Tab-separated table of C-alpha atoms and ligand atoms in Angstrom:
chain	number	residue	atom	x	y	z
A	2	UNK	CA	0.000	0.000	0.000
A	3	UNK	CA	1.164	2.948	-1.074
A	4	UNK	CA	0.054	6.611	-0.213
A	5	UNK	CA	-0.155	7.633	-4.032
A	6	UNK	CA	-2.728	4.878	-4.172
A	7	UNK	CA	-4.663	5.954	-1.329
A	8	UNK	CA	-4.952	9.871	-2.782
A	9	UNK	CA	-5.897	8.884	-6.381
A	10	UNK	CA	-8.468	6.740	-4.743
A	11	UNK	CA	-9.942	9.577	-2.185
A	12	UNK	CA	-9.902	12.650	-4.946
A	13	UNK	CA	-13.685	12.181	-5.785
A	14	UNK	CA	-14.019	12.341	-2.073
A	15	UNK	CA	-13.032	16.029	-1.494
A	16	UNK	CA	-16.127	17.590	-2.556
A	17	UNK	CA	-18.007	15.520	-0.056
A	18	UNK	CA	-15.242	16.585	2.211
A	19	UNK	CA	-15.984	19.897	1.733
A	20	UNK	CA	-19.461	20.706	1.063
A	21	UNK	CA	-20.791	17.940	2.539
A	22	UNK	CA	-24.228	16.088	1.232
A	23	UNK	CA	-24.078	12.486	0.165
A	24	UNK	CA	-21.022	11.027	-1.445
A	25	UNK	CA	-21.159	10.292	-4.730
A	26	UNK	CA	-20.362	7.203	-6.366
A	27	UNK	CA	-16.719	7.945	-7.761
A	28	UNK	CA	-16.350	8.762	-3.714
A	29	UNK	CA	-17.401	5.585	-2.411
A	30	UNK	CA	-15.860	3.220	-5.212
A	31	UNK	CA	-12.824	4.856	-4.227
A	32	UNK	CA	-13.656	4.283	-0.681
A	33	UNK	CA	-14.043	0.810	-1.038
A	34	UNK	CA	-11.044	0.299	-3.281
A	35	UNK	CA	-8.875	1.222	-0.555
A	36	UNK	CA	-10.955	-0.866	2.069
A	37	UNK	CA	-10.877	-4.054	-0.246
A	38	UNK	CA	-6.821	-3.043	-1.010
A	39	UNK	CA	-5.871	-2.676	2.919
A	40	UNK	CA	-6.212	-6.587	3.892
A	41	UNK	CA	-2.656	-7.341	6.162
A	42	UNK	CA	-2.517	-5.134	9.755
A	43	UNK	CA	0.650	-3.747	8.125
A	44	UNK	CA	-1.379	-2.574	4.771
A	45	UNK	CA	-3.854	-1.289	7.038
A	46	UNK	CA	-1.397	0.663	9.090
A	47	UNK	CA	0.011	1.791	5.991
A	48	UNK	CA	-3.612	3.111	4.471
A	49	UNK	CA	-4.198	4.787	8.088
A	50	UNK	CA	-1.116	6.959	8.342
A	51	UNK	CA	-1.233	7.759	4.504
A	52	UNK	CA	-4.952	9.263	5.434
A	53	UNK	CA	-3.208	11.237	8.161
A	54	UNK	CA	-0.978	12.723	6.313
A	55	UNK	CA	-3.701	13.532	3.193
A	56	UNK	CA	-6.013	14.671	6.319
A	57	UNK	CA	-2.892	16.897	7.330
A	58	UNK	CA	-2.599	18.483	3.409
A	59	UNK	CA	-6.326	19.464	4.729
A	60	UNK	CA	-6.019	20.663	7.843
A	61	UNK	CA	-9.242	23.038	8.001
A	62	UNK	CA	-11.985	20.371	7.192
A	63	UNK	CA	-13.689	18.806	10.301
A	64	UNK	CA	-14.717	15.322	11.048
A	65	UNK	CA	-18.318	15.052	10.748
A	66	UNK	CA	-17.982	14.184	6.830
A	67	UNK	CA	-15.573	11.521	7.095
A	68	UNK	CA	-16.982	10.345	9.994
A	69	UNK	CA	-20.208	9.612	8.241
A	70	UNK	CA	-18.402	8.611	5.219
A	71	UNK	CA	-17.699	4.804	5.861
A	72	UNK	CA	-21.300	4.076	6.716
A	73	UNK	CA	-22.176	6.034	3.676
A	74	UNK	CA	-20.365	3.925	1.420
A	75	UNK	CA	-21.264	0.609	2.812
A	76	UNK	CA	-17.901	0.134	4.530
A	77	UNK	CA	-17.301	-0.522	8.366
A	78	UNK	CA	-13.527	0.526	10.052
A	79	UNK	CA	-12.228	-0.175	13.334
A	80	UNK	CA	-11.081	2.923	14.012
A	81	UNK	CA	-12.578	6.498	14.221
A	82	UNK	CA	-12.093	8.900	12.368
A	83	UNK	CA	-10.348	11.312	13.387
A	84	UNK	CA	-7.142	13.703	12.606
A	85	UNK	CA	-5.759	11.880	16.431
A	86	UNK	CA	-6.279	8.276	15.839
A	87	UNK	CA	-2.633	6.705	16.514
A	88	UNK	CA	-2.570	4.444	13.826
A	89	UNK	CA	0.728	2.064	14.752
A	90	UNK	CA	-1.220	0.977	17.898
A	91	UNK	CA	-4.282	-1.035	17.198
B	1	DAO	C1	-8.084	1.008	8.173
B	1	DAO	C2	-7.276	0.720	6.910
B	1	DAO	C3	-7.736	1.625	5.769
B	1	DAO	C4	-9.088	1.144	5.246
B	1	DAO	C5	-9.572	2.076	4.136
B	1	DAO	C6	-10.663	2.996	4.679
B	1	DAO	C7	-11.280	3.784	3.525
B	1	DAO	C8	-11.179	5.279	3.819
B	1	DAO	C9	-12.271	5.676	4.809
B	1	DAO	C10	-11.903	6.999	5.477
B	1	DAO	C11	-11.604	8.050	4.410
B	1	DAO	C12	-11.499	9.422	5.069
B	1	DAO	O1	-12.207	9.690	6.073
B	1	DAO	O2	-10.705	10.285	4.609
B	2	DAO	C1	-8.947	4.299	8.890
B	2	DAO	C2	-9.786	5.563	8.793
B	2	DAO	C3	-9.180	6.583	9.746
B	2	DAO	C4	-8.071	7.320	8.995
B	2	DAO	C5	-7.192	8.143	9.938
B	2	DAO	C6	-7.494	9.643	9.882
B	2	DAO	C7	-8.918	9.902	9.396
B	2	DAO	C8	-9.445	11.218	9.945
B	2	DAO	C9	-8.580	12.352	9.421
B	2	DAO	C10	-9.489	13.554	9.208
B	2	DAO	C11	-10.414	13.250	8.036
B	2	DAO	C12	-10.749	14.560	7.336
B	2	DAO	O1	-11.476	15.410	7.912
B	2	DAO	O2	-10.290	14.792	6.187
């Protein structure tokens, strides 16, 4: 897993990010690409941190969105989300 991989697939994701609504469907294919391409605990680490440091290239949007966005897009997570999840320590 590679963070490359992980922005290409969230892209359609920023205007839900932004101006909220319902994701559309280039948003949650993309969602679920990364959820289906994240299988080992070390991929999944991997996927985490990468959306920490794409969360950190977008520092002024709050949580609400992306919280909402895995149930959204027919995906379930083990972790919140949030900008302070410690993703190494699951
Ligand atoms: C937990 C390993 C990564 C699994 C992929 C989750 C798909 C992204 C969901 C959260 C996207 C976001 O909130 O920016
Ligand atoms: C595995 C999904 C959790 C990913 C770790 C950070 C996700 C929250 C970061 C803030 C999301 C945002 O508002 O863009």
């Amino acid at each position: 897993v590679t963070c490359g991989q992980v922005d290409a697939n969230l892209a359609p994701c920023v205007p839900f990010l932004t101006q909220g609504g319902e994701p559309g469907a280039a948003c949650c294919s993309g969602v679920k690409t990364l959820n289906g391409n994240a299988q080992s605990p070390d991929d999944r680490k991997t996927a985490c941190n990468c959306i920490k440091a794409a969360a950190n290239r977008y520092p002024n949007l709050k949580d609400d969105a992306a919280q909402s966005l895995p149930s959204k897009c027919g995906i379930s997570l083990n972790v919140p989300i949030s900008r302070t999840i410690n993703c190494d320590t699951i």
